[PDB]
mmCIF file of C-alpha atoms in Angstrom:
data_model
loop_
_atom_site.group_PDB
_atom_site.id
_atom_site.type_symbol
_atom_site.label_atom_id
_atom_site.label_comp_id
_atom_site.label_asym_id
_atom_site.label_seq_id
_atom_site.Cartn_x
_atom_site.Cartn_y
_atom_site.Cartn_z
ATOM 1 C CA UNK A 1 6.850 0.870 -17.410
ATOM 2 C CA UNK A 2 6.262 4.570 -17.825
ATOM 3 C CA UNK A 3 2.641 4.616 -16.637
ATOM 4 C CA UNK A 4 3.473 2.769 -13.429
ATOM 5 C CA UNK A 5 6.740 4.587 -12.786
ATOM 6 C CA UNK A 6 4.892 7.929 -13.141
ATOM 7 C CA UNK A 7 2.132 6.729 -10.821
ATOM 8 C CA UNK A 8 4.780 5.731 -8.202
ATOM 9 C CA UNK A 9 6.518 9.129 -8.613
ATOM 10 C CA UNK A 10 3.162 10.681 -7.691
ATOM 11 C CA UNK A 11 2.868 8.397 -4.657
ATOM 12 C CA UNK A 12 6.345 9.575 -3.452
ATOM 13 C CA UNK A 13 5.169 13.242 -3.485
ATOM 14 C CA UNK A 14 2.041 12.204 -1.572
ATOM 15 C CA UNK A 15 4.241 10.510 1.043
ATOM 16 C CA UNK A 16 6.657 13.562 1.401
ATOM 17 C CA UNK A 17 3.741 15.857 1.926
ATOM 18 C CA UNK A 18 2.185 13.654 4.655
ATOM 19 C CA UNK A 19 5.591 13.192 6.385
ATOM 20 C CA UNK A 20 5.766 17.007 6.652
ATOM 21 C CA UNK A 21 2.418 16.961 8.544
ATOM 22 C CA UNK A 22 4.064 14.964 11.400
ATOM 23 C CA UNK A 23 2.553 11.629 10.679
ATOM 24 C CA UNK A 24 4.507 8.390 11.436
ATOM 25 C CA UNK A 25 6.047 6.966 8.197
ATOM 26 C CA UNK A 26 4.676 3.480 8.636
ATOM 27 C CA UNK A 27 1.137 4.783 9.059
ATOM 28 C CA UNK A 28 1.326 6.785 5.792
ATOM 29 C CA UNK A 29 2.935 3.744 4.135
ATOM 30 C CA UNK A 30 0.080 1.402 5.109
ATOM 31 C CA UNK A 31 -2.399 3.775 3.449
ATOM 32 C CA UNK A 32 -0.395 4.394 0.289
ATOM 33 C CA UNK A 33 0.219 0.616 -0.079
ATOM 34 C CA UNK A 34 -3.491 0.457 -0.928
ATOM 35 C CA UNK A 35 -2.954 2.696 -3.937
ATOM 36 C CA UNK A 36 -0.131 0.514 -5.211
ATOM 37 C CA UNK A 37 -2.052 -2.742 -4.742
ATOM 38 C CA UNK A 38 -5.051 -1.208 -6.472
ATOM 39 C CA UNK A 39 -2.986 -0.056 -9.420
ATOM 40 C CA UNK A 40 -1.459 -3.550 -9.867
ATOM 41 C CA UNK A 41 -5.066 -5.028 -9.669
ATOM 42 C CA UNK A 42 -6.206 -2.816 -12.518
ATOM 43 C CA UNK A 43 -3.156 -2.975 -14.751
ATOM 44 C CA UNK A 44 -1.535 -6.440 -14.240
ATOM 45 C CA UNK B 1 -4.977 -12.337 -3.297
ATOM 46 C CA UNK B 2 -2.526 -10.917 -3.645
ATOM 47 C CA UNK B 3 -0.752 -11.679 -0.451
ATOM 48 C CA UNK B 4 2.907 -12.183 -1.632
ATOM 49 C CA UNK B 5 2.658 -8.602 -3.123
ATOM 50 C CA UNK B 6 1.179 -7.249 0.164
ATOM 51 C CA UNK B 7 4.030 -8.948 1.992
ATOM 52 C CA UNK B 8 6.564 -7.526 -0.326
ATOM 53 C CA UNK B 9 5.200 -3.964 0.081
ATOM 54 C CA UNK B 10 5.045 -4.321 3.858
ATOM 55 C CA UNK B 11 8.765 -5.189 3.794
ATOM 56 C CA UNK B 12 9.526 -2.296 1.433
ATOM 57 C CA UNK B 13 8.103 0.143 4.008
ATOM 58 C CA UNK B 14 10.163 -1.353 6.829
ATOM 59 C CA UNK B 15 13.287 -1.205 4.601
ATOM 60 C CA UNK B 16 12.525 2.485 3.832
ATOM 61 C CA UNK B 17 12.385 3.253 7.580
ATOM 62 C CA UNK B 18 15.663 1.450 8.080
ATOM 63 C CA UNK B 19 17.294 3.614 5.475
ATOM 64 C CA UNK B 20 15.762 6.888 6.843
ATOM 65 C CA UNK B 21 17.084 5.859 10.315
ATOM 66 C CA UNK B 22 20.576 5.576 8.645
ATOM 67 C CA UNK B 23 20.250 9.185 7.697
ATOM 68 C CA UNK B 24 19.206 8.815 4.005
ATOM 69 C CA UNK B 25 16.329 11.247 3.104
ATOM 70 C CA UNK B 26 13.002 9.669 2.075
ATOM 71 C CA UNK B 27 13.071 11.383 -1.311
ATOM 72 C CA UNK B 28 16.509 9.854 -2.348
ATOM 73 C CA UNK B 29 15.452 6.371 -1.072
ATOM 74 C CA UNK B 30 12.240 6.642 -3.104
ATOM 75 C CA UNK B 31 13.824 6.842 -6.514
ATOM 76 C CA UNK B 32 15.590 3.488 -5.896
ATOM 77 C CA UNK B 33 12.363 2.093 -4.487
ATOM 78 C CA UNK B 34 10.310 2.982 -7.492
ATOM 79 C CA UNK B 35 12.651 1.007 -9.723
ATOM 80 C CA UNK B 36 12.547 -1.989 -7.289
ATOM 81 C CA UNK B 37 8.755 -2.018 -7.154
ATOM 82 C CA UNK B 38 8.406 -1.752 -10.930
ATOM 83 C CA UNK B 39 10.909 -4.640 -11.375
ATOM 84 C CA UNK B 40 9.124 -6.769 -8.852
ATOM 85 C CA UNK B 41 5.792 -6.365 -10.535
ATOM 86 C CA UNK B 42 7.312 -6.777 -14.097
ATOM 87 C CA UNK B 43 8.871 -10.078 -13.075
ATOM 88 C CA UNK B 44 6.151 -11.485 -10.843
ATOM 89 C CA UNK B 45 2.985 -10.346 -12.725
#
C-alpha cells in the first residue's frame, strides 16, 4: 500500500527527530499513534 | 472503535522499546515495523 507505507515512512522521520530532542520513546509513540489511527479512519 | 487497533499499536511501541533496549537502532527497527503495520491493517481492515 504505497500511500500508507509512505505515510508511515514520514512518521518514522518524525519519531527520529523527536528522539533526538531527549523525549522518552513511549511518550512520542503515544502521540504518533494518533496519526496512524487517524489515517486508518480516513482510508480504511 | 477501534480498540483492537489501538491495542495493537500500543504493543508495537512496547516491542520497539524492547528491540532498542537490545541495541537495535530505532531507524532499522522501523522499516520492519512499517511492513508489519501495513500487513495488519491490510488483513484486518
